[PDB]
Amino acid sequence: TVRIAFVGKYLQDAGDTYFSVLQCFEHCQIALQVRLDILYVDSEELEGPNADEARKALLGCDGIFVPGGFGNRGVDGKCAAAQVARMNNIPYFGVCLGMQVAVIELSRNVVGWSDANSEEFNKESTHQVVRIMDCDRNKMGANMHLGACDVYIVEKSSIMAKIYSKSNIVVERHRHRYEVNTAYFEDLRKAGLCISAVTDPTFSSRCRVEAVENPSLRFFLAVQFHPEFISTPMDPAPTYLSFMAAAAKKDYVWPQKCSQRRLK
Numbered sequence: 001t002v003r004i005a006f007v008g009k010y011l012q013d014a015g016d017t018y019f020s021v022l023q024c025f026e027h028c029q030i031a032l033q034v035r036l037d038i039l040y041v042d043s044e045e046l047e048g049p050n051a052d053e054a055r056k057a058l059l060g061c062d063g064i065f066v067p068g069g070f071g072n073r074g075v076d077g078k079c080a081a082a083q084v085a086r087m088n089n090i091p092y093f094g095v096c097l098g099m100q101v102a103v104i105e106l107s108r109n110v111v112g113w114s115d116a117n118s119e120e121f122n123k124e125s126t127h128q129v130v131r132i133m134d135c136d137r138n139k140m141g142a143n144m145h146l147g148a149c150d151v152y153i154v155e156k157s158s159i160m161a162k163i164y165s166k167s168n169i170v171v172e173r174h175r176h177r178y179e180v181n182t183a184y185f186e187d188l189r190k191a192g193l194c195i196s197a198v199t200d201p202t203f204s205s206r207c208r209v210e211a212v213e214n215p216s217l218r219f220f221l222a223v224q225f226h227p228e229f230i231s232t233p234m235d236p237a238p239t240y241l242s243f244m245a246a247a248a249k250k251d252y253v254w255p256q257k258c259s260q261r262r263l264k
């Protein structure tokens with residue numbers, strides 16, 4: 001059995017929020033032939049004076065997963081999940097908010113910006129490592145990115161390159177508003193983060209980060225897109241599949257060519 005820490009809420013109070021996420025995990029479970037055992041962890045237990053108690057629970061897991069979530073509930077705990085993963089070489093997979101907390105985590109604990117945050121959770125931060133792009137913004141509000149988008153895999157040695165069968169461009173679907181702040185790419189890179197996929201291969205101020213990795217570690221990957229929006233039992237999301245593979249301590253044969261479901 002493969003123990004995965006699922007960092008968000010208890011089953012009781014999740015509703016149907018993780019319906020598609022759990023479907024994807026199930027596609028993967030079948031493709032890999034592994035007994036998945038998800039630990040549903042309340043992210044708020046990973047913050048405060050007692051958090052070492054919750055951290056211990058994560059250390060006994062084979063993988064640590066942070067899904068998309070809503071509001072600012074448990075952001076510091078989700079960052080703390082990413083920290084445990086990074087410091088202990090426990091496979092990590094983050095989706096949307098899961099990628100944002102990997103960035104915030106790294107900014108606080110390695111870059112040394114104690115006040116690093118997303119603009120979403122702390123408008124007063126002097127290190128808004130995640131923020132709304134200027135081109136998306138109004139005086140009244142900002143774009144809600146939904147739908148399909150070209151994703152450029154820009155690091156040939158990355159997890160992304162591998163799991164998408166060396167395709168240079170793939171197509172994934174979105175639901176987000178805030179992007180990684182392009183002004184801090186150097187600092188993130190210096191701190192060990194690889195920007196492995198982007199919307200714009202020239203890395204301008206309009207370059208939207210689609211995937212980050214930490215190649216010092218066995219498996220540390222976080223994506224902006226929601227991979228669970230494209231997954232079937234026969235064609236599971238490669239991102240989720242590779243995470244579960246790493247957690248199970250198993251290999252997997254990637255196809256010679258990326259499935260057409262994720263190509264233009």
Ligand SMILES: [Cl-]
Nearest residue numbers: 008009043074
């Ligand atoms: Cl949560």
Ligand SMILES: [Cl-]
Nearest residue numbers: 159219242246
């Ligand atoms: Cl891998």
